[PDB]
Design a protein around this ligand. Structure first.
Ligand SMILES: Nc1noc2ccc(C(F)(F)F)cc12
Ligand SMILES: [Cl-]
Ligand SMILES: [Cl-]
Ligand SMILES: [Cl-]
Ligand SMILES: [Cl-]
Ligand SMILES: [Cl-]
Ligand SMILES: [Mg+2]
Length: 344
């Protein structure tokens, strides 16, 4: 057991191992209550997260367990991973607080004149991380520029696992939190799956090529009209797959529109980039390109290496369908804290 020391940060008393020094508040609070520090064991600048009220309700206790399970699983160069997890508690009986440690992320994609070569390398890395995530049967659901960390060498990592489900108010109006969402999830058309993430990668790729948001809708309905003007209105085959009779009836009220010519929308872009966008931005999610297929596309010929695009160990999420009491979720979380083994 390390020695812990106390200090007052972000309105509470933080208690952390002596290895973590020079603690200083950082960020807007998007990922929780976070301090920057220097880790004397590894030599890395790190982010230290103190969870607020981890076990206050069944909802919060299960949320805390989910975040810790996901972060413990992810071991890939293009995905956020866990450097450490700790508690000052000496037993289950006194366990109340959880602290998570990751690499400190400076800039996101938002923060960064991009050459076609820059767009190839950034989208290649998102797809390499997504092939890994999808091989574990994990769906990200919230890929957007603010969730992509990027360094001076253009190296990228994917963020945002096991945080609170976004609220209806958070998805309302002229907001970046909705602009990257697949239409079948934005409007609850059907049971969605991992294909929603490939729609998001198409929206990000288009914005790196043009410098402009692809679908900056003022509300859900304005955004749907911008999407159907580009990719066309649904045919009989997709309309059958829309489970909601009410959503099917609204779609049928709109005048039919053909798919647009993407060479006339993305004027001057690499023709191989135009071809890949056509295969990501397909309205029927069954017909979209997969991450594994997209890595083998000719746009990435300079970076693609089939012997260095790894898959994940299997990920058991049977807990997601389990009903437990607060103290049961708290005991599962405690076991995951004390069993943690750090990376080499
Ligand atoms: N659950 C997470 N997804 O992405 C993250 C980035 C940082 C942190 C941190 F450092 F605050 F713990 C947590 C997460
Ligand atoms: Cl220590
Ligand atoms: Cl990392
Ligand atoms: Cl504690
Ligand atoms: Cl964003
Ligand atoms: Cl597992
Ligand atoms: Mg998110």
């Amino acid at each position: 057991r390390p020695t812990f020391y106390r200090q007052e940060l972000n309105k509470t008393i933080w208690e952390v191992p002596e290895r973590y020094q020079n603690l200083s508040p950082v960020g807007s609070g998007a990922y929780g209550s976070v301090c920057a520090a220097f880790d004397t064991k590894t030599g890395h600048r790190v982010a230290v997260k103190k969870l607020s009220r981890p076990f206050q309700s069944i909802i919060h206790a299960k949320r805390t367990y989910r975040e810790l399970r996901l972060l413990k699983h992810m071991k890939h160069e293009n995905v956020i991973g866990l450097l450490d997890v700790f508690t000052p508690a000496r037993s289950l009986e006194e366990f109340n607080d959880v602290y998570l440690v990751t690499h400190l992320m400076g800039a996101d994609l938002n923060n960064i004149k991009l050459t076609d070569d820059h767009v190839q390398f950034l989208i290649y890395q998102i797809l390499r991380g997504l092939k890994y995530i999808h091989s574990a049967d994990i769906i990200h659901r919230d890929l957007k520029p603010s969730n992509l960390a990027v360094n001076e060498d253009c190296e990228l990592k994917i963020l945002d696992f096991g945080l609170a489900r976004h609220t209806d108010d958070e998805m309302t109006g002229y907001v970046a939190t909705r602009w990257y969402r697949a239409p079948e999830i934005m409007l609850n058309w059907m049971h969605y799956n991992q294909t929603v993430d490939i729609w998001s990668v198409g929206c990000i790729m288009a914005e790196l090529l043009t410098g402009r948001t692809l679908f900056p809708g003022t509300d859900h309905i304005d955004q749907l009209k911008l999407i159907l003007r580009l990719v066309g209105t649904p045919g009989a085959e997709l309309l059958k797959k829309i489970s909601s009779e009410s959503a099917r009836n609204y779609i049928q009220s709109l005048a039919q529109m053909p798919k647009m010519n993407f060479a006339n929308v993305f004027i001057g872009a690499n023709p191989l980039a135009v071809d890949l966008l056509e295969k990501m931005l397909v309205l029927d999610s069954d017909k979209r390109i997969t991450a594994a297929q997209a890595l083998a596309h000719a746009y990435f010929a300079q970076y693609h290496d089939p012997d260095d695009e790894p898959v994940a160990d299997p990920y058991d999420q049977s807990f997601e369908s389990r009903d437990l009491l607060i103290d049961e979720w708290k005991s599962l979380t405690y076991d995951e804290v004390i069993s943690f083994v750090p990376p080499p």
